[PDB]
Each structure stands twice: as C-alpha cells, then as structure tokens.
C-alpha cells in the first residue's frame, strides 16, 4: 500500500 513520500508532503501544500 502506498507510503507517504515527498510528493505526498508537497501535494498537501495545495488548496
């Protein structure tokens, strides 16, 4: 199952 990576961290700055 997907693991929290730098793309997830970065994506959570949008909206």
């Amino acid at each position: 199952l997907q693991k929290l990576n730098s793309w997830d961290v970065f994506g959570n700055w949008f909206d």
Partner: antibody
Amino acid sequence: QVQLQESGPGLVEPSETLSLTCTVSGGSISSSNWWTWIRQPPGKGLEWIGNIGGNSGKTFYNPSLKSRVTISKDTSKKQFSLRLSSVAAADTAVYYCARHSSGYFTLYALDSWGQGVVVTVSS
Amino acid sequence: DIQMTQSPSSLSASVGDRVTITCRASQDISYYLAWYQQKPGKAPNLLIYQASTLQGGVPSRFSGSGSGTDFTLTISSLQPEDFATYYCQYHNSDPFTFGPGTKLDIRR
C-alpha cells in the same frame, strides 16, 4: 498557535464502533498539517494510528489497524475524526489527536497534542 | 518497515547530572528522528526533531544527535522535574514508529 481538544466516549462495548473527534483552534483544518491519531494501551508505549493531510485529504494508516480505521475531517467545523470499527478488548487505550507539522518535502513532528481520552472496551 | 529500540529501558540519575539515552532504527532513517517526553497521565511533549533541532519552548538542557541508525538524547543539568518516559520516533514516513520508551527516575 494550534491547540487541540479531543472528545469522545470513555466506554464502548465489544464489536461496536469507537468514534473520537478533535477540535482545532489557531489554524485551519485545510493546511499543510497532517492531522494525526495516536494511542497508548495500558502499560505500553505509543502507537501511531494514522493521519490525514489537511489540504489533500490523503490518509495513511497503521497496517495493524487499517481495515478498521477511518480518519476524516471537516474544515467548516474545525474538526477531524477517528472511526475504529469492530472494537475488541485490545483496543482499550488512551487515544490522542495530534498535529504533525510539515516542511515542503519532508515532515517535522508531533508538536501539538490533545489531552487524551481514556477509552475502555468492555461489556 | 522500521523497528525502533531504545537503551537503557530504565535508569535513575541525580540532579545536576548529564544523562544520555539512546535509540536505534533497524534501517537508515537519515536525521528524521524525534524525541518526546511523557509525564505520567499526560500527552507527550516534543523535545527534538530532525535528530538535533530543539523545539521552541523546550529548555536549553535538552539536546539530540545522530544520523542514520544510531541516535541519542542528552539531558544536561538534570532537574528533578525531568523524571518521565522518553520516546524516540521516526517522524518522516509511515508507520512513524515510536521506540518502546526509556523510563527516567530521579535519584536522591
């Protein structure tokens, strides 16, 4: 800055669903934070349960619980929530909400915590 | 994924001491290690993150070091209110594993 207030029942019977809610002040739910749930069974250490991205809504769950855990958020009510279904005696624990601060590409840590709710699973 | 161990599991130290406790990760976690203090009956308090960054509001006598697998928390000028359980944590990816905790008692 951010302060967290937890709410929920102290007693749940086995096979029922446990729901907890955390109310946030000093910041929006919709933010780069990861809103988090942690528990501590009696006599044991701390166990991360899961989180939700304040802006993206992406959720991550501890593999020992993921089929029974759901984390959700409501920005207009300044809250985020935990649902633990099919509770058993082993889910007896103190449950905490927390704020996991973020950088741009890596995370910081759990810098703000609710006060804890003591949850007992029993008939 | 990540297994976290701490050593010693408990110790006593005297007021004025400079005490070091350790944490080890089963895999390289770079510097993404945090340290918490937990008082009996209370939520934990963050002391250190990124292995050596002191959190705002924490007393200057707490410090951390290490990178990779081996880390340490050092409490200088130990104070009587510093009794607690201390936990390390991998704080950059799931399942954000906490160590088992180290219980510190004050000797008198």
